[PDB]
Design a protein around this ligand. Structure first.
Ligand SMILES: *[C@@H]1O[C@H](CO)[C@@H](O[C@@H]2O[C@H](CO)[C@@H](O[C@@H]3O[C@H](CO)[C@@H](O)[C@H](O)[C@@H]3O)[C@H](O)[C@H]2NC(C)=O)[C@H](O)[C@H]1NC(C)=O
Ligand SMILES: *[C@@H]1O[C@H](CO)[C@@H](O[C@@H]2O[C@H](CO)[C@@H](O[C@@H]3O[C@H](CO)[C@@H](O)[C@H](O)[C@@H]3O)[C@H](O)[C@H]2NC(C)=O)[C@H](O)[C@H]1NC(C)=O
Lengths: 219, 213, 164, 221, 213, 110
């Protein structure tokens, strides 16, 4: 089939220019299909940004032309985005896709999508502190562990357990933002007993700051 | 300028009910340029119905499909844990492609209480002048709950921050997270730190901190 | 032959198309207000998440030749198939004790006709009295709803713009 | 799921009525093939119980019609079994399947199969105790661990290791029956050393009593 | 009505021998309504030969096939550990479909000893009044072996239960399992508990228990 | 991949065929490959066929069947058969006369 990979910065300051990129593989973006860019805002609202079909330099953007501006590179078989002068209003999730269209049929391809964050504040590494029940116990049943991520930006980070092996029973909440920094928490839960014994660590990663660090839990 | 407005915007039902989302529209759209997308968190909209009434390459039967004028539909034979998501009707009539909001879908499950636990600010977290006291409130029913941070005494706002999560996969439950951040000093002020989970579950607010000797 | 038969009198025998979605509909073959199809034809697509292999038998006990008008569907994209018929490669087979003819669909891109870029191929099978009709498809079958009566008589057809 | 799935109770009292079920997926049991039930007794002897082809309400049962009685539900595309009044003689493994047939060809589909037990005992949850060598060692080579299932009924139960990850070197013995209860044991065998360190558990499952529980082999060095 | 009888019913051979199963039959069956099934424990009969002589979608070459009147056959070029199982000739002539017994097929391999181990009753198992002392005797040769539970002294029956297994996959070995159950008390009666594995392997019955501390 | 040349001074007539199974498994069963293929050619000819698996009405027991095909090779040409399944190959060629013969449907007695 065809594949598409978003791409570009995780952030920018209000005013510069944004410049996404999609890499298609399995179809000459000159052989049909309307290569488009679609994003949705923090509020989870899908908004159509426009396209550029095999039809060429058509683009045939939306109703925010002023800057949504697109390209294609038939050689590299890839297409791009611009959006020029941006604001914080423009921070969201940017996706690229292709549609088929027929009067009786329809069919699309999207993408992992790239997150862009538009803000002044600076890319700033996070610190990881472990949440153990320590002091007082109160168990005789299932136990719960934490491990929180605080003081980071720009979004987003990824949390796990013993390298992903501990999937079930873990709730990683939505980081909450305060004065130019994010702070979140994850919530694993191992067997009533099984842990003290066994080693259990969270794996925190912040692409933004090349930060990859784990912090084994202990009582 | 097309104006699509899906109705419930946020809603629930049970495993077996006959769920039905709608989606109006500024003007009229020809019966084959309206579609529906089924998006779940962490994904990306997945196509679900083209030409107003045809299921995409995967969609299960329970999902009928309809629509005529400036008004359309969805519909589910029954309803499955699985079917729980948000939907967006897409249009392709006139050139500025539109979507409108969407209709979230929580589901019918239990009615049961939280499972809480209180936490001490790390030795690391401390060695930083920071004192983060986080309290988890996992897998409870109704998305709505209300905590209260005490210490030695306390009812109103302090310096807490919370962030619930979305209805779980197979639990279709919820979990929330309050976190108490203080000065290393202000923390080594007392050794009294309670978290108060208040629920529709029971009248007496499952308290947690150091309820023992 | 339909001209020489001189009669579109249709018997409407019923098949059991268990496990696929009957009565199709295209916006290019609309019936009044919305989508529609060919009166004498049935368009089958996936059940919900699949397309089982179809095997329907429809004997002929009347004392006259029966004329079956069926066909196959040709999608535009290798995915248009997947989309409709599950299997990535259809297959239709219509036979009798003495007949037999099998078709596979061709996936591709034709010119844009009345919206659609894919299309259908129409075929025919007649079964003599004392023989059975059998259909076996695992995709793209555009099955028939019944047989047309077969006259011998003295009729024809003519291209002519003369008013009667 | 996309073939044949048997179903029904793990047991019943001599005389009541047994009522199996087969869920076919991928073919309208109204499109050819003879949908039949076949069972084999404790002694391991396959017995042909009968059918019901596309041919409809045909059934065309065996020589024990008296009760073997079959149905189909075209809509749900599923077919059933009755056997009416049953004895203990009738306790065994019940399989459902479909046959092809052609004078020059033949080809079938079967099933995981369901075990039914005809007795008047009471379905009763099992207890799981772990087998570690603790006390004295005697090793310098591969180590062996246990984990036994005792006091359960009606059959059957399933045992595993670390969720099925440890497949090789494990023996699960035939549960032994005594006074209305079964008691079996499984026998894993991890590397000479590789264990004390690594976690190792057996996953015990008793459908009959909605019991699912595991017991990590708590090293008792 | 039409009884089939496969001959050896239970038999063995070696990796390389020319193994041959038969199957008689009350009356006559037309060479194309007789089949064979290859069943291994825990599975379900797997088809092996249709129309009296054609291998089904997978069976390997080493299996020839045949049969005429009221008498048929099987046959294997060589014989591999794998081919080791049981077989049933099926018949589809007359309406009461039949199968007859089957011919088991154990294999040949080594002559080698058990690997034994003794186990204490669980802290749990105990806390219930029960004391299950289990002793495993794995992957030995000849299915025949004889344990003896000792304690302080003992040759005859006591309160032990056993259950051997079937010829292994690639080992074509066996394993058994005696299990001693006592009253918590009667167990806390002494601290001696030997299990005695006696085999064709050596004369001196591989004992295990606490042959150290 | 077989080849069988024609050295004689006369047109050779080959009558062959291809087999169509009833089930996607009757193929597997018989020809291993999930999709047969047969080709019979010459320097000037060439014709290839692919089996249509399916269910034909019950005839003389069987529900599957065969498709008969023909190929003639002119003196000084070679015949080539290339199948990976369902090939119902020929055991030889028929002689080709030119003469003055025909065939007639009649019930009159000789
Ligand atoms: C392969 O290429 C052909 C042509 O290059 C594609 O067909 C074209 O499909 C587009 C839509 O994808 C049709 O565009 C529409 O044309 C009408 C009529 O002028 C106009 O009113 C619409 O607004 C739109 O422009 C176009 O008609 C059609 N062209 C032809 C002659 O076929 C075909 O879809 C391509 N297939 C794939 C899979 O890429
Ligand atoms: C596809 O459907 C057709 C018909 O629905 C199936 O053909 C039927 O196959 C059965 C056996 O599988 C034949 O049954 C035998 O018929 C004779 C003739 O009267 C009878 O003496 C035997 O006792 C038995 O009933 C039946 O004749 C045949 N019918 C026809 C017209 O084909 C076909 O097998 C199906 N294919 C698949 C794979 O489902």
């Amino acid at each position: 089939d065809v594949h598409l990979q978003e791409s570009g910065p995780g952030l920018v300051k209000p005013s510069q220019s944004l410049s996404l990129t999609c890499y298609v593989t399995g179809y000459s973006i000159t052989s049909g299909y309307y290569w488009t860019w679609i994003r949705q805002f923090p509020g989870n609202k899908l908004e159509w940004m426009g396209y550029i079909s095999y039809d060429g330099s058509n683009n045939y953007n939306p109703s925010l032309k002023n800057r949504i501006s697109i390209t294609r590179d038939t050689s590299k078989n890839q297409f791009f985005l611009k959006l020029n002068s941006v604001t914080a209003e423009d921070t969201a999730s940017y996706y690229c896709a292709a549609f088929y269209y027929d009067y009786d049929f329809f069919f699309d391809y999207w993408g992992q999508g790239t997150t862009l964050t538009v803000s002044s504040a600076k890319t700033t590494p996070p610190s990881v502190y472990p949440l153990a029940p320590g002091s007082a116990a109160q168990t005789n049943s299932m136990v719960t562990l934490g491990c929180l991520v605080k003081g980071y930006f720009p979004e987003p980070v990824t949390v796990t357990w013993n390298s992903g092996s501990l999937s079930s029973g873990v709730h990683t909440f939505p980081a909450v933002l305060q004065s130019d920094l994010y702070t979140l928490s994850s919530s694993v839960t191992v067997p009533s007993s099984t842990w003290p014994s066994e080693t259990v660590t969270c794996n925190v990663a912040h692409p933004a700051s090349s930060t990859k660090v784990d912090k084994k839990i202990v009582p | 300028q097309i104006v699509l407005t899906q109705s419930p915007a946020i809603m629930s039902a049970s495993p077996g009910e006959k769920v039905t989302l709608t989606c109006s529209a500024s003007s009229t759209i020809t019966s084959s340029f309206l579609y529906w997308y089924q998006q779940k968190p962490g994904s990306s909209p997945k196509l679900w119905i083209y030409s107003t009434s045809n299921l995409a390459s995967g969609v299960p039967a329970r999902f009928s499909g309809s629509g005529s004028g400036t008004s359309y539909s969805l519909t589910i034979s029954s309803l499955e844990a699985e079917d729980g998501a948000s939907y967006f009707c897409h249009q392709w009539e006139t050139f500025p492609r539109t979507f409108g909001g969407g209709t979230k879908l929580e589901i019918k499950r239990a009615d049961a209480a939280p499972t809480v636990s209180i936490f001490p600010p790390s030795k690391i977290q401390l060695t930083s002048g920071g004192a983060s006291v986080v309290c988890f409130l996992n897998n409870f029913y109704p998305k709505d709950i209300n905590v209260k941070w005490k210490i030695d005494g306390s009812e109103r706002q302090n310096g807490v921050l919370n962030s619930w999560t979305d209805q779980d996969s197979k639990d279709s439950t919820y979990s929330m997270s309050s976190t108490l951040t203080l000065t290393k000093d202000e923390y080594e002020r007392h050794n009294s730190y309670t978290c108060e989970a208040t629920h529709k579950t029971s009248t007496s607010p499952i308290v947690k901190s150091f309820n023992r000797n | 032959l339909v001209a020489s038969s001189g009669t579109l009198e249709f018997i409407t025998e019923g098949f059991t198309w268990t496990g696929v979605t009957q009565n199709g509909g295209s916006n290019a073959c609309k019936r009044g207000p919305g989508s529609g199809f060919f009166s004498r034809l049935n368009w089958l697509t996936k059940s919900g998440s699949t397309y089982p292999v179809l095997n329907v038998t429809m004997p002929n006990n009347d004392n006259f030749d029966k004329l079956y008008i069926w066909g196959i569907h040709h999608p535009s994209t290798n995915q248009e198939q997947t989309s409709l018929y599950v299997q990535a490669s259809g297959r239709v087979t219509v036979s009798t004790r003495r007949s037999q003819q099998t078709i596979i669909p061709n996936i591709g891109s034709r010119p844009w006709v009345r919206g659609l870029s894919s299309r259908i191929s129409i075929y025919w099978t007649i079964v003599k009295p004392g023989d059975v009709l059998v259909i076996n498809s695992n995709g793209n079958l555009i099955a028939p709803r019944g047989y047309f009566k077969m006259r011998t008589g003295k009729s024809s057809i003519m291209r002519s713009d003369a008013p009667i």
